[PDB]
Amino acid sequence: GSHMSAGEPHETDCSEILDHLYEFLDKEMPDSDAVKFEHHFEESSPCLEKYGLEQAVKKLVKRAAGQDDVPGDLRAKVMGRLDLIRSGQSVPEHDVAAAPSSSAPQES
Protein backbone atom coordinates (compact mmCIF):
# COMPACT_ATOMS: atom_id res chain seq x y z
CA GLY A 1 0.00 0.00 0.00
CA SER A 2 2.28 2.77 -1.29
CA HIS A 3 0.14 4.60 -3.86
CA MET A 4 -3.33 3.14 -3.23
CA SER A 5 -4.60 2.58 0.33
CA ALA A 6 -8.10 1.52 1.41
CA GLY A 7 -7.56 0.09 4.90
CA GLU A 8 -10.45 1.37 7.01
CA PRO A 9 -10.09 1.16 10.85
CA HIS A 10 -12.49 -0.39 13.40
CA GLU A 11 -15.85 1.43 13.28
CA THR A 12 -19.47 0.90 14.35
CA ASP A 13 -21.89 3.28 12.57
CA CYS A 14 -21.57 5.58 9.55
CA SER A 15 -24.89 6.09 7.70
CA GLU A 16 -26.09 8.07 10.73
CA ILE A 17 -23.22 10.54 10.28
CA LEU A 18 -24.33 10.93 6.70
CA ASP A 19 -27.94 11.19 7.90
CA HIS A 20 -26.81 14.40 9.66
CA LEU A 21 -24.78 15.64 6.69
CA TYR A 22 -28.11 15.61 4.81
CA GLU A 23 -30.80 16.82 7.27
CA PHE A 24 -28.21 18.69 9.37
CA LEU A 25 -26.88 20.52 6.36
CA ASP A 26 -30.15 21.06 4.42
CA LYS A 27 -32.74 21.04 7.25
CA GLU A 28 -30.86 23.05 9.88
CA MET A 29 -28.60 25.89 8.65
CA PRO A 30 -26.14 25.41 5.70
CA ASP A 31 -23.86 28.18 7.05
CA SER A 32 -24.64 27.83 10.77
CA ASP A 33 -23.57 24.17 10.65
CA ALA A 34 -19.80 24.19 9.97
CA VAL A 35 -19.11 24.88 13.67
CA LYS A 36 -21.88 22.52 14.81
CA PHE A 37 -20.64 19.91 12.32
CA GLU A 38 -17.09 19.39 13.72
CA HIS A 39 -18.66 18.08 16.98
CA HIS A 40 -20.55 15.16 15.38
CA PHE A 41 -18.04 14.90 12.53
CA GLU A 42 -15.15 14.17 14.94
CA GLU A 43 -17.04 11.58 17.03
CA SER A 44 -17.16 9.25 14.00
CA SER A 45 -13.98 10.03 12.04
CA PRO A 46 -13.75 6.31 10.99
CA CYS A 47 -17.07 6.69 9.12
CA LEU A 48 -15.59 9.43 6.97
CA GLU A 49 -12.58 7.10 6.38
CA LYS A 50 -14.73 4.46 4.69
CA TYR A 51 -15.88 6.38 1.62
CA GLY A 52 -13.47 9.31 2.00
CA LEU A 53 -15.83 11.85 3.54
CA GLU A 54 -13.33 13.19 6.11
CA GLN A 55 -11.53 15.19 3.42
CA ALA A 56 -14.89 16.59 2.30
CA VAL A 57 -16.64 17.23 5.65
CA LYS A 58 -13.44 18.90 6.95
CA LYS A 59 -13.99 21.35 4.10
CA LEU A 60 -17.66 21.84 5.08
CA VAL A 61 -16.52 22.72 8.59
CA LYS A 62 -13.84 25.03 7.14
CA ARG A 63 -16.40 27.56 5.87
CA ALA A 64 -18.50 28.37 8.99
CA ALA A 65 -20.41 31.65 9.45
CA GLY A 66 -18.74 34.73 7.95
CA GLN A 67 -16.38 32.76 5.69
CA ASP A 68 -17.32 30.72 2.57
CA ASP A 69 -20.42 29.79 4.65
CA VAL A 70 -21.58 27.27 1.99
CA PRO A 71 -20.86 27.57 -1.77
CA GLY A 72 -23.62 25.07 -2.51
CA ASP A 73 -20.97 23.18 -4.47
CA LEU A 74 -19.65 21.39 -1.37
CA ARG A 75 -23.07 20.55 0.04
CA ALA A 76 -24.50 19.40 -3.30
CA LYS A 77 -21.31 17.39 -3.52
CA VAL A 78 -21.58 16.00 0.01
CA MET A 79 -25.36 15.31 -0.06
CA GLY A 80 -25.03 13.77 -3.51
CA ARG A 81 -22.14 11.77 -2.09
CA LEU A 82 -24.32 10.58 0.79
CA ASP A 83 -26.86 9.52 -1.80
CA LEU A 84 -23.93 7.80 -3.51
CA ILE A 85 -22.53 6.43 -0.23
CA ARG A 86 -25.89 5.25 1.11
CA SER A 87 -26.60 3.73 -2.34
CA GLY A 88 -23.05 2.72 -3.36
CA GLN A 89 -19.29 2.84 -2.67
CA SER A 90 -17.64 4.01 -5.93
CA VAL A 91 -16.56 7.64 -5.41
CA PRO A 92 -15.36 10.32 -7.89
CA GLU A 93 -12.77 13.13 -7.76
CA HIS A 94 -14.80 15.51 -5.55
CA ASP A 95 -11.57 16.62 -3.82
CA VAL A 96 -11.08 19.04 -6.74
CA ALA A 97 -13.40 21.38 -4.86
CA ALA A 98 -10.58 21.82 -2.32
CA ALA A 99 -7.27 20.52 -3.72
CA PRO A 100 -7.80 17.79 -6.40
CA SER A 101 -6.03 14.52 -5.51
CA SER A 102 -8.58 11.68 -5.18
CA SER A 103 -6.75 9.31 -7.58
CA ALA A 104 -5.35 11.18 -10.60
CA PRO A 105 -4.28 14.75 -9.58
CA GLN A 106 -3.04 15.52 -13.11
CA GLU A 107 -4.80 12.81 -15.15
CA SER A 108 -3.22 13.06 -18.63
Domain boundaries, the chain: 1-108
Residue 17 to residue 9: CA distance in whole angstroms: 16
Helix crossing, 15-26 with 54-63: angle to 10°? 30
- Sign of the C-alpha dihedral, residues 22, 14, 85, 99? positive
82, amino acid identity: L
Residue 81 · residue 94 · CB < 8 Å: yes
**Structure solved via:** NMR
